[PDB]
Design an enzyme around this catalytic site. Structure first.
Site, PDB file in Angstrom:
ATOM      1  N   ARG A 141      94.049   7.195 119.438  1.00 44.17           N
ATOM      2  CA  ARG A 141      94.161   7.883 120.719  1.00 44.17           C
ATOM      3  C   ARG A 141      93.251   7.264 121.772  1.00 44.17           C
ATOM      4  O   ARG A 141      93.544   7.350 122.970  1.00 44.17           O
ATOM      5  CB  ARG A 141      93.840   9.367 120.546  1.00 44.17           C
ATOM      6  CG  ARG A 141      92.404   9.640 120.130  1.00 44.17           C
ATOM      7  CD  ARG A 141      92.157  11.121 119.897  1.00 44.17           C
ATOM      8  NE  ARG A 141      90.808  11.369 119.403  1.00 44.17           N
ATOM      9  CZ  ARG A 141      90.470  11.381 118.121  1.00 44.17           C
ATOM     10  NH1 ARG A 141      91.364  11.172 117.168  1.00 44.17           N
ATOM     11  NH2 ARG A 141      89.203  11.608 117.787  1.00 44.17           N
ATOM     12  N   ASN A 142      92.150   6.638 121.352  1.00 42.38           N
ATOM     13  CA  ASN A 142      91.201   6.020 122.267  1.00 42.38           C
ATOM     14  C   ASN A 142      91.391   4.512 122.366  1.00 42.38           C
ATOM     15  O   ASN A 142      90.439   3.792 122.687  1.00 42.38           O
ATOM     16  CB  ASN A 142      89.767   6.351 121.850  1.00 42.38           C
ATOM     17  CG  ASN A 142      89.414   7.806 122.086  1.00 42.38           C
ATOM     18  OD1 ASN A 142      89.966   8.453 122.975  1.00 42.38           O
ATOM     19  ND2 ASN A 142      88.489   8.325 121.290  1.00 42.38           N
ATOM     20  N   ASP A 155      86.852   5.228 125.995  1.00 40.51           N
ATOM     21  CA  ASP A 155      86.109   6.426 125.610  1.00 40.51           C
ATOM     22  C   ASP A 155      84.878   6.071 124.779  1.00 40.51           C
ATOM     23  O   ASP A 155      84.605   6.658 123.730  1.00 40.51           O
ATOM     24  CB  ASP A 155      87.015   7.409 124.866  1.00 40.51           C
ATOM     25  CG  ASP A 155      87.638   8.439 125.790  1.00 40.51           C
ATOM     26  OD1 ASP A 155      87.215   8.520 126.962  1.00 40.51           O
ATOM     27  OD2 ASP A 155      88.555   9.163 125.349  1.00 40.51           O
TER      28      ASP A 155
HETATM   29  C1  LIG Z   1      96.840   8.953 122.716  1.00 46.77           C
HETATM   30  C2  LIG Z   1      96.966  10.061 123.460  1.00 46.77           C
HETATM   31  C3  LIG Z   1      95.912  10.590 124.468  1.00 46.77           C
HETATM   32  O1  LIG Z   1      94.774  10.769 124.038  1.00 46.77           O
HETATM   33  N1  LIG Z   1      96.207  10.890 125.858  1.00 46.77           N
HETATM   34  C4  LIG Z   1      97.515  10.714 126.500  1.00 46.77           C
HETATM   35  C5  LIG Z   1      97.512   9.483 127.432  1.00 46.77           C
HETATM   36  C6  LIG Z   1      96.254   9.349 128.360  1.00 46.77           C
HETATM   37  O2  LIG Z   1      96.634   9.085 129.717  1.00 46.77           O
HETATM   38  C7  LIG Z   1      96.076   7.939 130.262  1.00 46.77           C
HETATM   39  C8  LIG Z   1      94.696   7.716 130.205  1.00 46.77           C
HETATM   40  C9  LIG Z   1      94.032   6.554 130.743  1.00 46.77           C
HETATM   41  C10 LIG Z   1      92.562   6.281 130.700  1.00 46.77           C
HETATM   42  N2  LIG Z   1      91.620   7.189 130.101  1.00 46.77           N
HETATM   43  C11 LIG Z   1      90.171   7.170 130.324  1.00 46.77           C
HETATM   44  C12 LIG Z   1      89.193   7.068 129.299  1.00 46.77           C
HETATM   45  C13 LIG Z   1      87.801   7.046 129.578  1.00 46.77           C
HETATM   46  C14 LIG Z   1      87.362   7.127 130.911  1.00 46.77           C
HETATM   47 CL1  LIG Z   1      85.600   7.102 131.273  1.00 46.77          CL
HETATM   48  C15 LIG Z   1      88.281   7.225 131.957  1.00 46.77           C
HETATM   49 CL2  LIG Z   1      87.777   7.328 133.658  1.00 46.77          CL
HETATM   50  C16 LIG Z   1      89.682   7.248 131.678  1.00 46.77           C
HETATM   51  F1  LIG Z   1      90.530   7.338 132.640  1.00 46.77           F
HETATM   52  N3  LIG Z   1      92.044   5.149 131.247  1.00 46.77           N
HETATM   53  C17 LIG Z   1      92.925   4.241 131.845  1.00 46.77           C
HETATM   54  N4  LIG Z   1      94.255   4.394 131.929  1.00 46.77           N
HETATM   55  C18 LIG Z   1      94.844   5.562 131.378  1.00 46.77           C
HETATM   56  C19 LIG Z   1      96.293   5.797 131.436  1.00 46.77           C
HETATM   57  C20 LIG Z   1      96.920   6.926 130.911  1.00 46.77           C
HETATM   58  O3  LIG Z   1      98.291   7.154 130.962  1.00 46.77           O
HETATM   59  C21 LIG Z   1      99.123   6.196 131.633  1.00 46.77           C
HETATM   60  C22 LIG Z   1      95.277  10.588 128.253  1.00 46.77           C
HETATM   61  C23 LIG Z   1      95.244  11.396 126.898  1.00 46.77           C
END
Ligand SMILES: *CCC(=O)N1CCC(Oc2cc3c(Nc4ccc(Cl)c(Cl)c4F)ncnc3cc2OC)CC1
Length: 303
Positions: A141-142, A155
């Site tokens: 997931r991360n 993460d």
């Molecule tokens: C595997 C499933 C899951 O955990 N998720 C569904 C998709 C995710 O949506 C997107 C997240 C991001 C992120 N995340 C992120 C992590 C750490 C930090 Cl510090 C920050 Cl600011 C973040 F934004 N980062 C970049 N791009 C995406 C794109 C996603 O969907 C297109 C969330 C939960």
């Protein structure tokens, strides 16, 4: 450090929620530079508040460390907004996480993709080992998908925030932690090798849940008895041996990320020998034509 930009409330906006998690809620956002007319898509994390009541000086010191990673397969923190909630800003990965990608395309993933994702995730983890940084929450997931040929680990560092005796389905990732992490809260680079093994298991099972239907409170019991995750149907024995060696009770007997990179790279040069996917002969990496097209549009970094 010039690697962490401090943002104002008025220069970014949350426009759509992408998901939640143990650390916070993720929003697709738009960054509006001062004096400009453009809107730049970003990702925003509005974190929870479990941080042992004490910080600001600590919230910024960890952000300086999270914003200093420089590796193609590790996501870099770009900005932070210290308001009523600490909002973190990074580059947007429109493909989402690797877990959801592998679940949605579970019948379209070849062994060359699966083996290359393990090499890249191992390369990203080996970076944090040399920078002396423990992830503590490595999972499918991360792992974000920049392009289907390029994944990155995210993460990181967000460990200084949660905790709470909720380790007795929850917040802390019981089914991804090493045995010493569950019993004694020992987090080392060898316990991250355990999490890497479970993350490989998730990929090889096309997004299946580890120890499905088993209470998290009983995982440490079944592990001490010697139970491990079963062999996925597509895995040859050479790959499953690697997963079993990541889950040894002796942390010093588990392989090192430097060793996992070399072995998975060896298997990637002959992918059909080590992964058995029904008809894995048509699922091939993109041609030099499409890779140049992807990188010119979405992935201009070095590797
Ligand atoms: C595997 C499933 C899951 O955990 N998720 C569904 C998709 C995710 O949506 C997107 C997240 C991001 C992120 N995340 C992120 C992590 C750490 C930090 Cl510090 C920050 Cl600011 C973040 F934004 N980062 C970049 N791009 C995406 C794109 C996603 O969907 C297109 C969330 C939960």
């Amino acid at each position: 450090q010039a690697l962490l930009r401090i943002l104002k409330e008025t220069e970014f906006k949350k426009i759509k929620v992408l998901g939640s998690g143990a650390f916070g809620t993720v929003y697709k956002g738009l960054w509006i530079p001062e004096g400009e007319k453009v809107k730049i898509p970003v990702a925003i994390k509005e974190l929870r508040e479990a941080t042992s009541p004490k910080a600001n000086k600590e919230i910024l010191d960890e952000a300086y460390v999270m914003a200093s990673v420089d590796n193609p397969h590790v996501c870099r923190l770009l900005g932070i907004c210290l308001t009523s909630t600490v909002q973190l800003i990074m580059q947007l990965m429109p493909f989402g996480c690797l877990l959801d990608y592998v679940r949605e395309h579970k019948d379209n993933i070849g062994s060359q993709y699966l083996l290359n994702w393990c090499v890249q995730i191992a390369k990203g983890m080996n970076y944090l080992e040399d920078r002396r940084l423990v992830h503590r929450d490595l999972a499918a997931r991360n792992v974000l998908v920049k392009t289907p040929q390029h994944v990155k680990i995210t993460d990181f560092g967000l460990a200084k925030l949660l905790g709470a005796e909720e380790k007795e389905g929850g917040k802390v990732p019981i089914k991804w932690m090493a045995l010493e992490s569950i019993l004694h809260r020992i987090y080392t680079h060898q316990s991250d090798v355990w999490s890497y093994g479970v993350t490989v298991w998730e990929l090889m099972t096309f997004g299946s849940k580890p120890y499905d239907g088993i209470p998290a409170s009983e995982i440490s019991s079944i592990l001490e008895k010697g139970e491990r995750l079963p062999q996925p149907p597509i895995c040859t024995i050479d790959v499953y041996m690697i997963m079993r060696k990541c889950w040894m009770i002796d942390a010093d007997s588990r392989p090192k990320f430097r060793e996992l990179i070399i072995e998975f790279s060896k298997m990637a040069r002959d992918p059909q020998r080590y992964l058995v996917i029904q008809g894995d002969e048509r699922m091939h990496l993109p041609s030099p034509t499409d890779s140049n097209f992807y990188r010119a549009l979405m992935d201009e970094e070095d590797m």
